[PDB]
Amino acid sequence: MFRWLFLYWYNSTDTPSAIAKVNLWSYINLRLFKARLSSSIAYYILGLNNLELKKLKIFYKNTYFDYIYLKSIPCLFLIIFFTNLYLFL
């Protein structure tokens, strides 16, 4: 269970050479699912001593319809007001 490729490949003890001694290869230890990065953008920039990883998270993905409707109320009222202005114009 790893999130970062460098941490995943730094010290690997379940390599084929090590596992061949016991000759047991569990299906739960597949490289396909062994590591998976996070869904947030991460990019490296030069630091004072070495590369450092900065994460760019822009918006959340768990907002709900109540919050959305509360944020949208002003737009609906503005639409109504503009329509009323047009009608009275």
Partner 1 sequence: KLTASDEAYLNEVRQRYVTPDMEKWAYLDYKKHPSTTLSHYDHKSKDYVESERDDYNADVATNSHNKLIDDFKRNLQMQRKVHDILQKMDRPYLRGVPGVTKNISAGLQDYSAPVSKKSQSDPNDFYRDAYRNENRWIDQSVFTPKTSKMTHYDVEWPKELASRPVTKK
Partner 2 sequence: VQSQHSVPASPIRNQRHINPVRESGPLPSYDGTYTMEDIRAVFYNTTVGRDYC
Partner 3 sequence: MIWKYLQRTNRGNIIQAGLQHRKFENLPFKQNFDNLTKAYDLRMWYISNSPHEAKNLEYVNELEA
**Contact between 56 and 40 (Cβ < 8 Å):** yes
Q: Whole-angstrom Cα distance, residue 81 to residue 77? A: 6
Determine if 21 is a binding residue for partner 1 (CB under 8 A). yes
Copy the structure tokens of residue 67: 């919050």
Longest dimension (CA), the chain: 87
* Residue 23: CB minimum distance to partner 2, A: 14
Residue choice 1, 15, 58, 66 for contact with partner 2 (CB under 8 A)? 15
Nearer to partner 2, 15 or 62 (CB): 15
Nearer to partner 1, 17 or 86 (CB): 17
Which DSSP category does 40 fall into? S
Q: What residue ranges bind partner 3 (CB under 8 A)?
A: 1, 28, 64, 66-67, 70, 73
